[PDB]
């Protein structure tokens, strides 16, 4: 039940996202970068990784 009532206010506050969504699409490949999960592939050692 609580999720049902809290949903209308949780959704509303996502008006914050309207600026950041538009600015994400401006940079090429940034939109795909943000949606995908971050993973450690083969050969990426955390002590050598710069983010």
């Amino acid at each position: 039940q609580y999720e049902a009532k809290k949903a209308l206010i949780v959704e509303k506050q996502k008006q914050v996202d309207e600026s950041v969504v538009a600015e994400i699409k401006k940079v090429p490949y940034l939109k795909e970068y943000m949606a995908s999960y971050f993973t450690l592939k083969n050969g990426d050692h955390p002590h050598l990784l710069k983010f």
């Binding site: 490949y29 970068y33 990784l49 710069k50």
Partner: protein
């Protein structure tokens, strides 16, 4: 016959130590195990020092008219005459060193683009080869 020798004037590449992947020139041979390398400190940054041969690798360049105990003043003059820096950058080792410097300054986002692009290009290049 062997092509690369440990001699005076032979340009060597440091493999380990604080000056790894830096160019150097042999200026005097102490014995079979040690040589004196003075890859111009004003150019490459490797000071005149004694190095065991196990910690360097010979290249295909020999500086002309380099004699035993050649001074750093004159060695720098002959080092830039043969354009060892220009020529070395065109070799497989020269590009291998440059690539490693390029890769070590890649963040997560840059590695993300390459993996996406390289996967598509490699897959596209596989599609373009017919099977008959």
């Amino acid at each position: 016959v062997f092509s690369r020798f440990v001699e005076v004037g032979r340009v060597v590449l440091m493999k380990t130590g604080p000056f790894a992947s830096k160019l150097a020139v042999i200026v005097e041979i102490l014995d079979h195990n040690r040589v004196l390398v003075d890859g111009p400190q004003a150019i490459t940054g490797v000071p005149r020092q004694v190095v065991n041969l196990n910690t360097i690798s010979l290249t295909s360049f020999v500086v002309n008219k380099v004699t035993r105990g050649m001074t750093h003043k004159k060695l720098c003059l002959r080092f830039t005459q043969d354009a060892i820096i220009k020529r070395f950058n065109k070799t497989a080792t020269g590009k291998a060193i440059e690539k490693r410097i390029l890769r070590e300054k890649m963040t997560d986002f840059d590695k993300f683009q390459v993996s996406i692009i390289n996967r598509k290009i490699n897959a596209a290049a596989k599609i373009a080869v017919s099977k008959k």
